Structure formats: structure tokens, C-alpha cells
């Protein structure tokens, strides 16, 4: 129409055209990703029923047996309830608008927030006694062999209490790893017995520079063993700078961790999500880990891999130390924490599992 | 179009083959000591009378030379870091960034620094964290420098500035200039090269 | 497909080339669609009677779309250029059923590139070295792609739950909900396949 | 002490950063080149001293020597790479035929490299599409307008167009070429853009 | 009143001021220039007074023969568009600095043996040479006083710039002047005096040259130093019977 | 990328203009031209409707957000939100610059649209300075920029970019 009888309209054109464990972790993680070529969807959509069964077991100390493999893990009640089982855990501080896991380098998440413990000190008094209380009957509770460990977490520095036969030992211990000088001095005028396993006033301050140099670093970790650990949680009860009297975390006591119930406990529950991929995010303690493999061997038919993000503060707690029936434990846990520690200050990065046979990495 | 594009230098602890910078950077000397004496070497020291380096001798080596010859087992030789970058310096540059003359402390700063990272040593953890917040205490202050500085003569910001910066610099105000003219209708010519001009020159 | 939708794809291709920091898939399949339709038009211009302001019009359309295509396949051409030793070895190893990246042309200039580059670098200076120093590994001298650069991108596909520095739990949100339509800045590493597949654009 | 001269070649080069390919050092490379051949000489002759006759502590000489050999033969591959670089962007800018002037400074080998370099390029050029290839040197800015207003800069005799009739082509004149034929006489210098 | 439309002519020349062609292209003289300068870190901006002739013939006018409060409405008027312009700015920048105005103008220059008595209170344009200056002492803008007895304090008094003071009051609202200046709570800025000679040339025969003094302030203090040929802008003001001391407020420097 | 491509990709939106000549319809590669009739309006590209009106054959005809109601709507809503808005059109500064440079006398009450629109361009541009520091200043990996237009991304591109390379090399080194 009006072209010269030779224009190609241009769509004319185109039409023409192995080992059988992993050696014990005891440090922090705080998140989990499983990847698995099968699903991940069983762990989703939980019944109230099977909630509440996995509350009453845990509270209870039921163990569970698992079988071989699972070709319907939907399906499976058992299955289900011991993933609700294994994702509790009790802290005794309970302020839900307060993150209370992570105390050591976190400043961002703590900005701006309603504290009114940091000026008011009845208050502030009223939360070490229960904190003091809880500390008490959570250390006596360790030691009648009720409880495996559990973790106390300041702001400064982070402890850990074992109990007698965990990690190869034979009594009761204790691990500090960011320890100071003044700190260290202040625990040999009190009758403890610690050891690091890690102007003439002026040639004594060279003296000391040798021994202050690794201060506030991993390599300060102090070991307190035996009878010891009594006068420890004294010390620690009665000490002035557990709690921070300037800063973001001013007035707040330390946050005590525990397998199990406690004076003042506040149980909780870590947050599963599956996208295969699942996601567990939390304050992540050695038993849930091994309990949480357990479960994903039989239902990944042994076939899976974790990849762990660890807290840095707390990997120096796998440095070497060398009847636990009713600590409320299943049984092949308490075998795998009874073993020799083998990383040194090195933790975890990654797990992976095929074919029944675990490849630490 | 750029039509001549040489070899970028690499920046952290590796280097690029090809790179003009990074073959002048490791030039630099740094502090060294002879763990092992260098037989038959002595020539290089013009005061030394024997013809042997003797064991336990110091010298300022230079940073390519250090790198091949070091090893874990600080057999054959063993590094001390310069002065800029021991604690008295780090110190100083925790006070305040923007008052260094990082062009008269080095002219590479941060690939010299991060170059150290390869011989161990017991503060690398400090010397990494020195180095990233110098960096982003300085960044601010480059980056209004390069944006808000039209037809003005640019000899007196870039004098306190190593390598780095310095480019950080051409690139904004080059990203201004584009702006600048093309609003005031000046981008609509074709024009010859800059290489074109400056050979027509000679 | 349109020929509209096809000067799209490559405008698409074009903006996707310029912001990479590797070599992306080949696309010679637009690049020959778009060369037959502008051969064609020419003579289809050229038969048109002298005067007539259509001859205008497609002769600026021609112009128009000449230019896109020639600065694709010049950025192709530099990044070819800038890392042929990795490219090539990455052809050599190219397993079935993946895309090639290069096309045939490509291949060949790249063979030539390198060619005259080791025997100009053997002649001049490797002949008189040392017999021990006489073999440089081209593979471990030229540089390689910067995967970690930061770029810009606009999402077309919904995708969720995208993991911002893997590696890293320091960063405070780890998890980004990508939505239609939205732009971020992030790392060339992460969004790669995103990229690959087409559910995001480099703008 | 060693690699003197190297660094010194490296920095003449560095000096000059906009291209401006400089005359070729063929003494410095031939200085180099004698100062490697008698560190491997004396390095050979240390290796089998400490050979035969037992004498552990030549090692650290050994790996000194060493480590001088790999600088001076990086900063040759580093040297002849940038003058590389350097010569590839004559041919994207100053045409196809180079200048006497800027040829008068390249090496033989390097000629060949060019003139290699040129016909790859030629035939990846034809190869694109049917019949002639598109020339990817040309279009190198966004189009506007079909016949722009430009102005000679010095005399360059008669410029033919495909009709078959040049364009006496004297300074200080002005002709309304259409764009495609006066691209490339731009970019060279010969013509200069008149915008109203 | 008047002076809010002033105030409002004065933001609008500075908001819509535009150079060039449509053969070209338009750029925003002013406003680009303040936000260059206020993300910089200068104060300051140069206002011609042929543009501001061009813009409003009577805004130019008004500036000629009443500098004082046309000038600092002038730059009240700089200020509200340089914070308009940077608006969200920076943690820690939220409040907005004063800006500076000096002025430039391509007229004739006068003498100093010029200078009459009618022209008090307007602006100049006189060169000359520098001969001596001063150390940079502080000059107050903003004080605060407190009584001696009862303490009451008011506070934010603005006082007028150039060698002026402020009488201090009386009255209590606690003897006679009760009232003393509070140390920390003052806003100081640069000040400087210099001595201007009139021109080798322009002296008569037989007669020694004259001299004059100059005030300096802000931005334009440690610009000049003894020895240098300037061009001053200024307003000429005032500091035997009912003689006063003559100075000449200095708005801009142009050193030769 | 120079900001003349950004503009050659901002000379393909749609405006209407009121052609003086007779013409049949045109089948251009992307698309069909509408039959050219003197007196009627045709919409066509923004670079034919440039190239017509530089050649004295048509009448630009003002797009509908180019009103000073709409414009200072838009400009108060921008000073008011703390993150980016969404714009009349993803070009509006270059369609601003070319249609008012090239047919003001066609365009009624050019200059207070040109400067309504310099204004929320200067909004946004402190906008995105600002989010260019809090980005350095907290060391993070990701960041939202919604409602973005491209040459504001390209007046600090290759820049920022460039910047956040060298940081995290410098962040990532013992690992
Ligand atoms: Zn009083």
C-alpha cells in the first residue's frame, strides 16, 4: 500500500526465516542448614497432638528408636515427635523483647531498646537473686549426676560446666576462655586452683607482658577441676564485673543454658523452616546436633549434608581434659560425649553424609 | 571507550602476573634478618670485607625477594614489620583517618599491608582490621572530594592520597564530568581520542 | 516471536553483556535473526523511489539498531580478548547438554589471538633465556574474572529465600525475599544463576 | 644488587600512561639477558659443587639465584605484554594502514603480531552474517542524525565517496556529508563535528 | 511585611537563575553551586550583581544603596536554599549551617580621595594596596547573659555584625546591670582588620599617599596578606565634635 | 555506561505529535507506524518526534504528567518519604531536558516544570548519597533500591561499584 512493489514486510522476513561418628563439638552453633536430594517436608505442618507428645517427652526423658530407614517419613508419628523433642531447650532469663544467646560482640541488636534494669536497682537486685538462685540449684543439679552440662554466658567471658566422665575427664570441670590477668589474680586470693592449659616494678610489668599478651584472646583459657569448681561458683555469685555497670547490656545477669528443667527455667524452642533445604536457627547445644543427625539419617535414608555456623567465642571449649544414665540423655549421645577431644580451638564448618558413612570437613 | 586498558593490580594478598603496579610495589624494602648465612654473597654487602653474608646479619630486602625466600620453617629468613605498621602507628590511625599523608607514608598502602598477611606473624589479626577501617573511615571524604568538585584545580585534594584513592578519585570525577556535560548539550559531538591528540602533539 | 520481541532480546542481551564481569552465554541465533532482517531492509530501502521520507525513517531505524548489535558483539570481543587462556581451557573441558559460550567464529579468533601471542612472546624473549626458565604458564599469568564485583539487577521471576554472604553468619539479615519488579545491589556471585536463567536482568 | 635494570625498563613505560607506545629498549633486554645467563652459570656451577663435593650450605644461594632469575623474567613478560597493549589500540583507532610515525617505533616482530592481529580480525569481521561482515570498529556512538555539518582541519587531497566523485578536501571548509562516511575521518583528526 | 517579600524575591533569584541557550542547554548557576559548596564543606558562595540586575532590576537596586539588611536577607535567603537542596542529609548534620554571600561586579572602580560624605552607607568599590593587617581575633554573633543575683537567663541574643556592639540591659525583669555575659555559651567567629594605601599612581604630586581601614570576617580573613594589590567591595560605615571613626565593611576580595 | 546511552535508551517512549504532512503507514522493525494525516494526532517514537520538530513537520504534543498540579504533587510526595517513590515515567529527566530544550514554544509554563523537576531530582540525588554511605559505613552485602530511575543510578555508578570491591577484598583476607 504506497511501497514500491519489492518491501518485505519485516515479519514477512521472519516468517521466511567413612567413619561411623563425627568427634564431639562443644562449642555454640547458632544456625543450621541441612541440604538433601529428598524432601524435607515431613518436618513441616506439625500436628498440636505431636507437639504436645514431644513436649511430655522431653519433660519426661523418653528415648526413641528410630528404625534402619523411613520410606514414609510423613507419615511417621514417631519421627515427627522426636523432632519436636529435640528442638526444646530451657534458659532461665525469660525477657522476650531481650536477645539473651549471643551476649559476647553484639551491640546492633541491642540498640534501642525498653531496659528499665539498667537505672533501677531494686530491680536490678531482684534479678541477681533469682539469677543467683537458679545458678545455685542448676550447679547442684550437676552434681548428683541429673545434668550433663550447661553453659553460662556473660558478657565478657563464657563458662562451661561438665560433668564427671564427660570429654574423657573424671571430675567435675570448668572452662573459661576469655580470662584476664586481674581476673586470674582475683581467683588465686580466693583458694582456686586453676591452670592454663594454653624501675624494678617496671622489669615486673615485662615479666607480666609476657604473660599479658594473649589476654582477651582464645589462648587465655583457664581450667578449674575438682573441689575447685564449688568455690568457682562462689567467686562467680559474689563477683563484681559479671554484670556490666556501663554500656547496652547494663544491669542484665548472665544468661544460663541447660539440656534440662532448673529453678527459674523458661522452656523454649529453636525455629525450624524448610524451603531441599531446612533451616534451624538458635542457640544450637551438642545433644540437639547429634539428636537432630540421628533423625535425618533415618529419614535421608543416610544421605545428607550440614553446614554449621559457629559461635567464635566459645570454639576454644574442644581443648583436651584428660554412671550417666540418669542425666536425661539417649544413649548414643551420651557415648559420643564421652569420647577424647580431638579439634583444638577449631570447630565444625561442615558435614556431610552418604551412604551411612560420615566426612567431616 | 577507553582504548587503552592496561593490567588492573590485583588488590589483597595476591598479585597479577601482568601488572605494572603490583611488579613495582613488591620493589619496596622491608626489615629482614638472615636466619642462615648466604655463602659466596658477601658482594652484595659493599661493607663486608668477606665474601660470605654472614649468619645472623640484617638487611632491608626487598618484598619479592622476602616472599621467595621465606618459609614456615624461618630457616632462611624471618620478617619484622615496617614502622607504619607496628602498634604506635596503628594506634595513631585509630585516632583519626583523614589526617595521614598516605602518599608520603607509602605510595601503596593497602596492597603493601596486605601483602605483609603472607609472612606470618602473631598480629595479622590487627593488621587486617587496621587497614579495612582505615579504609572506611577514608572513603567518605574521597568520595565528596571526587563528586562535588567542578572546573577546579584537583592538585591539592590528591595530594594526600596513595594509588587506591587516587583512582577512586579519577573515577568520580570522571562520573561528574559525563553528567555535567551532557546536560549542557556538549556529549553530541564526535570527537577524536585523547591517545589521537596527545600523538598528534609530538 | 515478533520482530519487536526480538529487537527486545537484544537490547536485553546487550544491557546483560555490558555489566557482567565474566563471558556469558552465546546468543548467535538474535544476532543472525537481526543481521538477515537489516540485509534485507537495505535492499528493500534502496528500491524505494528517491525522495520519499519512509527512506528516512528506515534508513534511522537501520542506524538505530546497527549500533546495539555492533557494541554486543564488541564487548564479547574485549572480554574474549581480556581472558582467552581461561576461556579456551573452559571449551576444551565443555561437557554435552550445557550451552556452548562461544560460538564458532569466537573460537577460532581466540585460537589465532592465542597463537600470536605465544609464538611473539617465545620469539622475542624465551628463545635466548635460560634453558631451565624457557615454559610460562599462560594459564596461571593472565588474569581471571572478578565473580565477587558488586552489581545492579531488576527482578522479573519471584524468587525466595536468597542467601546474602553464605560464608559469613556476621551479617545481621542472611535471607532476602526477592519480589517482581524490585532492584537491589548485590554481588555478581550470588545472582549468577539467576542471570543464567533469565528470571533477572543486569540494569 | 640484581633486577636494577628491569624496574627501570618497567618504570619508563609506567611514566607514560596514555598509550604513547615509546621506542623499543633493546640494551636494557640484552643487559638482562647476559646478567641471567651468568647467574645460571654460577648458579649451575654452585649446584653441582654442593653436588659432588658435599657442601649443604649452598642451598640458600641456590634459591637466591633462583628468585633473581624468575623477577628478571617476569618483568620481560610484563614489559613485552603492555607495549602488546599498547600496539593492539592503533588498530581500532588510527584505521587499518599505520602511520610512518608510530611504525617507525615498533619492533619487526611486533609488525607481524599488527599485521597478524589485523587479518584475525578481518576475517571474524567477514564472517559475521552474509556477504560483508558488519564492521564492529565503526558505530561507536549512539546515532542522532543522518548528515551532519563537519569542517576540515588540514588538507588530505580528495576524499571519494562510493557515487565515484572525491571532495577536494582543503582546511577551513565545509561540507554536509551524510555521518556514515565521516566517522572514521573524525575520530583520525581529518575533520572536525560543527554543531549549530 | 516587606521584608518577607524581599526575603521570598531574594530564594526565588536564587531557586530559578538559569545560563545558556536552548541551542545548548541550561545549568542552574546558583543553586548547583551552593549544594557543591555546602557538601564540600565551604560556606560560601560569589553572587555576581549584573545577574541579579538581570533577574530583578529594583532587588539590585536595593543593594546598591542599602546593603546592610538587604544583604543579610540575602543571606538568610542562601541558607533556607542550601538546606532545601541537601534536605536529607547525614546522621549527625541535621542542623543546617549559615552561609556567606559575597558579591563581584564588573563597574569602574572609584579613589579613595573619591569617597564623599553622601556616600555613607553604600556600596564601593575602591582598589589599593595592602600595607599591614592584624592577628585573627574572635568576633561574638551570638551571647547569652545571666543575672548575678537571680540568675534568670536570656538567651540567643543576635548581635549586629561589623565594629558594633550591644548595650546590655538595665532592668532585671538584683541591682543596676545585673547582667553578665555567660563564657560557653557564645558563638565566635574569625575577625581581622587590615590598612588599604591608595594606588601609586592615583596619589597627587607632592603629597603623601592616604590610607583607610578595612574589616574583615569569616571566610574572608588570612586571604590577603601585606604587600598584595586588591580591588575591595565594601560598605562604607562609621564606627573634635561629633567626629566618628570612618572603616569600610569588607563583602569581597578580588587580590590582583 | 555514559549517560548518551542512557539517553538513546530514553529516545524509544511514546509521545504524540500533530503532524503538518500526508503519509500512508510505515512498517518499521519495531512496529507500525499510524497512517500520517495533516492535522490528527499519531503517536511515534520520542526520536522521530525529535527529528520532525528539529525539520519543522509536526507540533509536539506536552505528555500528560508534565502539569504543574501533578509536578508539585510529585515533589511534595518525594520530600515526605524516607525511601526512593515511584516517578511519572522511567526517563522523566530525559524526556524533561529533550522535549523542553527542543519545543518550548509548544509546551506552555516550561520553566516552573523545569523547575519542579530539578528539585526532585536534587531530593533524590541526596537520597541516594545518603544510602551510599549508610551502605559503606555498615559493612553490609545488600541493599533495596526501589523506584530507582537509570541516570541517577549512573551519576554514581563506577563509582560505588568499584568501592565496594576493594571493601570487601579488604574485608575478606585471612579467610
Ligand atoms: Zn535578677
Known amino acids: 500500500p504506497g511501497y514500491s512493489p519489492s518491501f518485505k514486510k519485516p515479519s514477512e522476513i521472519l516468517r521466511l526465516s567413612g567413619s561411623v561418628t563425627f568427634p564431639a563439638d562443644w562449642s555454640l552453633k547458632t544456625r543450621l542448614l541441612f541440604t538433601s536430594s529428598h524432601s524435607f517436608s515431613w518436618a513441616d505442618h506439625l500436628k498440636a497432638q505431636e507437639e504436645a507428645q514431644g513436649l511430655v517427652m522431653q519433660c519426661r526423658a523418653t528415648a526413641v528408636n528410630l528404625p534402619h530407614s523411613i520410606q514414609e517419613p510423613k507419615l511417621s508419628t514417631d519421627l515427627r515427635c522426636a523432632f519436636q523433642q529435640s528442638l526444646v531447650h530451657w534458659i532461665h532469663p525469660s525477657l522476650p523483647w531481650v536477645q539473651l544467646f549471643p551476649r559476647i560482640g553484639v551491640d546492633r541488636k541491642m540498640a534501642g531498646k525498653n531496659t528499665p534494669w539498667s537505672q533501677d536497682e531494686s530491680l536490678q537486685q531482684v534479678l541477681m537473686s533469682e539469677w543467683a538462685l537458679s545458678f545455685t540449684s542448676l550447679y547442684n543439679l550437676l552434681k548428683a549426676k541429673l545434668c550433663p552440662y550447661f553453659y553460662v554466658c556473660t558478657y565478657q567471658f563464657t563458662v562451661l560446666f561438665r560433668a564427671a566422665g564427660l570429654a574423657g575427664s573424671d571430675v567435675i570441670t570448668a572452662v573459661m576462655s576469655p580470662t584476664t590477668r586481674g581476673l586470674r589474680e582475683a581467683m588465686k586470693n580466693e583458694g582456686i586452683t586453676f591452670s592454663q592449659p594454653l624501675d624494678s616494678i617496671s622489669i615486673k610489668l615485662r615479666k607480666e607482658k609476657n604473660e599479658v599478651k594473649l589476654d582477651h584472646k582464645p589462648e587465655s583459657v583457664v581450667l578449674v577441676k575438682g573441689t575447685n569448681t564449688f568455690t568457682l561458683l562462689n567467686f562467680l555469685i559474689n563477683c563484681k564485673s559479671i554484670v556490666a555497670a556501663a554500656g547496652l547490656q547494663a544491669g542484665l545477669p548472665p544468661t544460663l543454658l541447660s539440656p534440662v528443667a532448673f529453678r527459674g527455667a523458661t522452656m523454649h524452642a529453636l525455629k525450624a523452616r524448610s524451603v531441599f533445604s531446612l533451616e534451624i536457627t538458635g542457640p544450637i547445644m551438642p545433644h540437639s546436633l547429634h539428636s537432630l543427625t540421628m533423625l535425618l539419617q533415618s529419614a535421608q535414608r543416610g544421605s545428607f549434608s550440614a553446614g554449621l555456623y559457629t559461635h567464635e567465642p566459645t570454639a576454644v571449649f574442644n581443648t583436651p581434659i584428660h554412671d550417666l544414665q540418669n542425666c536425661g540423655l539417649h544413649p548414643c549421645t551420651v557415648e559420643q560425649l564421652t569420647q577424647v577431644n580431638e579439634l583444638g580451638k577449631l570447630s565444625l564448618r561442615h558435614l556431610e553424609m552418604t551412604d551411612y558413612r560420615y566426612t567431616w570437613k | 571507550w577507553e582504548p587503552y586498558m592496561p593490567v588492573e593490580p590485583g588488590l589483597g594478598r595476591e598479585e597479577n602476573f601482568l601488572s605494572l603496579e603490583d611488579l613495582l610495589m613488591s620493589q619496596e624494602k622491608l626489615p629482614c634478618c638472615i636466619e642462615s648465612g648466604f655463602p659466596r654473597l658477601g658482594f652484595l654487602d659493599k661493607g663486608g670485607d668477606s665474601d660470605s653474608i654472614p649468619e645472623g646479619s640484617k638487611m632491608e630486602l626487598p618484598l619479592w625477594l622476602a616472599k621467595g625466600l621465606y618459609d614456615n620453617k624461618r630457616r632462611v629468613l624471618s620478617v619484622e614489620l615496617p614502622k607504619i605498621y607496628r602498634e604506635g602507628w596503628r594506634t595513631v590511625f585509630s585516632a583519626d583517618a583523614n589526617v595521614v599523608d598516605l602518599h608520603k607514608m607509602g605510595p601503596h598502602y593497602y596492597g603493601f599491608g596486605s601483602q605483609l598477611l603472607n609472612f606470618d606473624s602473631p598480629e595479622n589479626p590487627e593488621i587486617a582490621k587496621t587497614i579495612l577501617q582505615t579504609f572506611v573511615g577514608r572513603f567518605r571524604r574521597i568520595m565528596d572530594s571526587s563528586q562535588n568538585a567542578y572546573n577546579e584545580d584537583t592538585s591539592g585534594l590528591v595530594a594526600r592520597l596513595d594509588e587506591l584513592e587516587r583512582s577512586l578519585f579519577r573515577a568520580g570525577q570522571r562520573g561528574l564530568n559525563a553528567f555535567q556535560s551532557w546536560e549542557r548539550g556538549k556529549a553530541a559531538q564526535i570527537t577524536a581520542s585523547n591517545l589521537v591528540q596527545n600523538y598528534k602533539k609530538r | 516471536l515478533t520482530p519487536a520481541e526480538l529487537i527486545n532480546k537484544l537490547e536485553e542481551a546487550w544491557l546483560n553483556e555490558k555489566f557482567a564481569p565474566e563471558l556469558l552465554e552465546s546468543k548467535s541465533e538474535v544476532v543472525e535473526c537481526v543481521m538477515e532482517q537489516l540485509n534485507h531492509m537495505e535492499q528493500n530501502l534502496h528500491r524505494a523511489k528517491p525522495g520519499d521520507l519512509k527512506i528516512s525513517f528506515h534508513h534511522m531505524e537501520i542506524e538505530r539498531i546497527r549500533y546495539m548489535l555492533s557494541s554486543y558483539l564488541r564487548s564479547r570481543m574485549l572480554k574474549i580478548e581480556k581472558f582467552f587462556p581461561h576461556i579456551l581451557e573452559k571449551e576444551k573441558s565443555r561437557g554435552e547438554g550445557e550451552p556452548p559460550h562461544l560460538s564458532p567464529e569466537e573460537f577460532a579468533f581466540a585460537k589465532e589471538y592465542m597463537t600470536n601471542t605465544e609464538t611473539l612472546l617465545k620469539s622475542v624473549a624465551l628463545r635466548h633465556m635460560p634453558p631451565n626458565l624457557q615454559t610460562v604458564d599462560l594459564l596461571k599469568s593472565v588474569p581471571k574474572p572478578n565473580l565477587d564485583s558488586f552489581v545492579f539487577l531488576r527482578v522479573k521471576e519471584e524468587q525466595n529465600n536468597i542467601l546474602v554472604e553464605p560464608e559469613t553468619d556476621e551479617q545481621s539479615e542472611y535471607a532476602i525475599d526477592m519480589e517482581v519488579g524490585s532492584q537491589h545491589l548485590i554481588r555478581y556471585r550470588t545472582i549468577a544463576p539467576l542471570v543464567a536463567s533469565g528470571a533477572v536482568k543486569l540494569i | 644488587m640484581f633486577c636494577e635494570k628491569a624496574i627501570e625498563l618497567i618504570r619508563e613505560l609506567q611514566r607514560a600512561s596514555d598509550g604513547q607506545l615509546p621506542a623499543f629498549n633493546e640494551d636494557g633486554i640484552r643487559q638482562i639477558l647476559e646478567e641471567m645467563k651468568a647467574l645460571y652459570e654460577q648458579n649451575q656451577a654452585d649446584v653441582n659443587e654442593a653436588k659432588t663435593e658435599g657442601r649443604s650450605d649452598l642451598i640458600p644461594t641456590i634459591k637466591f639465584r633462583h628468585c633473581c632469575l624468575l623477577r628478571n623474567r617476569r618483568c620481560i613478560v610484563a614489559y613485552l605484554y603492555d607495549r602488546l597493549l599498547r600496539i593492539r589500540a592503533l588498530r581500532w583507532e588510527y584505521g587499518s594502514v599505520l602511520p610512518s610515525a608510530l611504525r617507525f617505533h615498533m619492533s619487526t616482530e611486533e609488525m607481524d603480531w599488527f599485521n597478524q592481529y589485523k587479518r584475525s580480525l578481518a576475517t571474524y569481521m567477514r564472517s559475521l552474517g552474509g556477504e560483508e561482515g558488519l564492521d564492529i570498529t565503526q558505530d561507536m556512538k549512539p546515532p542522532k542524525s543522518l548528515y551532519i555539518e563537519v569542517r576540515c582541519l588540514r588538507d588530505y587531497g580528495e576524499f571519494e565517496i562510493d557515487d565515484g566523485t572525491t571532495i577536494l578536501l582543503k582546511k577551513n571548509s565545509q561540507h554536509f556529508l551524510p555521518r556514515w562516511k565521516c566517522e572514521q575521518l573524525i575520530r583520525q583528526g581529518v575533520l572536525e563535528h560543527v554543531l549549530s | 511585611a516587606k521584608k518577607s517579600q524581599l526575603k521570598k524575591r531574594f530564594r526565588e533569584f536564587l531557586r530559578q537563575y538559569r545560563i545558556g541557550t536552548d541551542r545548548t542547554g541550561f545549568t542552574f548557576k546558583y543553586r548547583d553551586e551552593l549544594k557543591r559548596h555546602y557538601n564540600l564543606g565551604e560556606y560560601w558562595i560569589e553572587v555576581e550583581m549584573e545577574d541579579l540586575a538581570s533577574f530583578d532590576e529594583d532587588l539590585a537596586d536595593y543593594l546598591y544603596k542599602q546593603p546592610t539588611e538587604h544583604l543579610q536577607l540575602l543571606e538568610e535567603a542562601a541558607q533556607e536554599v542550601a538546606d532545601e537542596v541537601t534536605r536529607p542529609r547525614p546522621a549527625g548534620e541535621e542542623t543546617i549551617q549559615e552561609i556567606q554571600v559575597m558579591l563581584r561586579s564588573d563597574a569602574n572602580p572609584a579613589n579613595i580621595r573619591s569617597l564623599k560624605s553622601e556616600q555613607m552607607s553604600h556600596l564601593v568599590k575602591i582598589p589599593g594596596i595592602i600595607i599591614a593587617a592584624t592577628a585573627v581575633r574572635a568576633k561574638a554573633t551570638k551571647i547569652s547573659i545571666q543575672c548575678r543575683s537571680c540568675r534568670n537567663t536570656i538567651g540567643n541574643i543576635a548581635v549586629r555584625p561589623g565594629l558594633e556592639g550591644y548595650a546590655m540591659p538595665r532592668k532585671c525583669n538584683c541591682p543596676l546591670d545585673p547582667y553578665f555575659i555567660i563564657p560557653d555559651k557564645c558563638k565566635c567567629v574569625d575577625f581581622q582588620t587590615l590598612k588599604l594605601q591608595e594606588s601609586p599612581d592615583a596619589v597627587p604630586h607632592g603629597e603623601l599617599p592616604r590610607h583607610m581601614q578595612l574589616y574583615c570576617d569569616r571566610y574572608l580573613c588570612d586571604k590577603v596578606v601585606p604587600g598584595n594589590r586588591v580591588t575591595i567591595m565594601g560598605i562604607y560605615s562609621i564606627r573634635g565634635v561629633g567626629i566618628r571613626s570612618s572603616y569600610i565593611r569588607v563583602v569581597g576580595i578580588q587580590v590582583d | ?175
Open chain 6, 1 to 175: 555506561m555514559d549517560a548518551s546511552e542512557v539517553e538513546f535508551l530514553a529516545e524509544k517512549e511514546q509521545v504524540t505529535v500533530i503532524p503538518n504532512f500526508s503519509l500512508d503507514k510505515v512498517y518499521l522493525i519495531g512496529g507500525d507506524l499510524g497512517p500520517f494525516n495533516p492535522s490528527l494526532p499519531v503517536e511515534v517514537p520520542l526520536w522521530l518526534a525529535i527529528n520532525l520538530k528539529q525539520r519543522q513537520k509536526c507540533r509536539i504534543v506536552p505528555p500528560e504528567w508534565m502539569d504543574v498540579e501533578k509536578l508539585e504533587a510529585i515533589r511534595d510526595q518525594e520530600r515526605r518519604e524516607e525511601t526512593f517513590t515511584p516517578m511519572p515515567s522511567p526517563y522523566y529527566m530525559e524526556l524533561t531536558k529533550l522535549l523542553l530544550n527542543h519545543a518550548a514554544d509548544n509546551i506552555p509554563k516550561a520553566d516552573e516544570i523545569r523547575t519542579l523537576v530539578k528539585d526532585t531530582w536534587d531530593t533524590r540525588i541526596a537520597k541516594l548519597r545518603l544510602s551510599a554511605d549508610s551502605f559503606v559505613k555498615g559493612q553490609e552485602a545488600h541493599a533495596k533500591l526501589d523506584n530507582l530511575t537509570l541516570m541517577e543510578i549512573n551519576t554514581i555508578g563506577t563509582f560505588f561499584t568499584e568501592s565496594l570491591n576493594h571493601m570487601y577484598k579488604l574485608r575478606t583476607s585471612l579467610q
